[PDB]
Amino acid sequence: RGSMKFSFELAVNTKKEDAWTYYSQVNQWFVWEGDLEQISLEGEFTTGQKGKMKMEDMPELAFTLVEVRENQCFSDLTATPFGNVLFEHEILENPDGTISLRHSVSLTDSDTTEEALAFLKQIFADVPESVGKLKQILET
Amino acid sequence: QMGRGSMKFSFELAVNTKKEDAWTYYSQVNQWFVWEGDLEQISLEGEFTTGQKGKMKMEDMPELAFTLVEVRENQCFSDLTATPFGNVLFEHEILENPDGTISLRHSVSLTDSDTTEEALAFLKQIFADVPESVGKLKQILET
């Protein structure tokens, strides 16, 4: 590969089905996507669906749903200067009864560019907060 | 190994290399200078095996005790250090990729029942130079 990937995992005290609600309902991404301005999806929340997303003070971006698995995970793919960025969201079950939420950002490929890595870091910088917000919302 | 209160940062990098070669930079404590950028001193009370204790000192920081909690050649090794936020666990994983290439994944985690900013910021700090550390291992292994 030319792969590089950042992950953040946070354990939360709730049910995977309840977590799934905030993922599979694009209109509720505002509660956890920091800076989300507008969001839309060209159909059902399923593997292969295309949508449009826009963060504050940024051009709106097309994305495609890569691997929707109900109650478990969904991924989205967006084109960037550095090629396709894959964003992953996983609900993991822990033995102690909690679930964990793991969000990951990766650059499909690139020969370890100094600016590639710096690019991922910036995208990934907001991720821990967003996962934090989910946890506090889910533990209500 | 995660559960209530835990948080964990991971960085993974694909490297065109073999697992045995990567493992030599993990299992030999004296090699950590190649990939630990602020490393000043490093020792281990014996052989690179699960349970072994050791010490290490980083630029501008006091010496620190640490334990090897899990070792598997040539897959992974993990160490535990005590901090003001409980124990921090550092993980180092070698993963064989389906295109022959391997991946190195370094992670750091701790347990904070409160999930405070203090604990978060503290973990984030430790994880901050982990991507470059892994990048050095990449550069070294690919020659």
Residue numbers in the entry:
A (entry chain A): -2 to 137
B (entry chain B): -5 to 137
Give excerpts from the publication.
The crystal structure of SMU.440 has been determined at 2.4 Å resolution using the SIRAS (single isomorphous replacement with anomalous scattering) method and all residues except the last one could be fitted into the electron density. In addition, five residues from the N-terminal His6-tag were also observed in the structure. SMU.440 is comprised of three α-helices and a seven-stranded antiparallel β-sheet, bending into an unclosed β-barrel. There are two molecules per asymmetric unit (ASU) and they form a homodimer via a pair of antiparallel β-strands. A large forked cavity is formed as the β-barrel wraps around the long C-terminal α3-helix. The volume of the cavity is about 1 050 Å3 with a surface area of ∼700 Å2. The cavity is comprised of Trp26, Trp29, Glu30, Asp32, Met50, Met52, Met55, Phe60, Phe71, Asp73, Thr75, Thr77, Val82, Phe84, His86, His100, Val102, Phe116, Ile120, Asp123, Val124 and Ser127, most of which are quite conserved residues among the SMU.440 homologs. In the bottom of the pocket are primarily aromatic residues; whereas at the top of the pocket, close to the cavity opening, the residues can be divided into two parts, one side with mainly acidic and the other with neutral residues.
One such case is SMU.440 (GeneID: 1029579), which is composed of 138 residues. SMU.440 is a hypothetical protein without any known functions or protein family classification. SMU.440 also shares a similar binding pocket composed primarily of residues with aromatic and acidic side-chains, which points to a potential binding of a polyketide-like molecule.
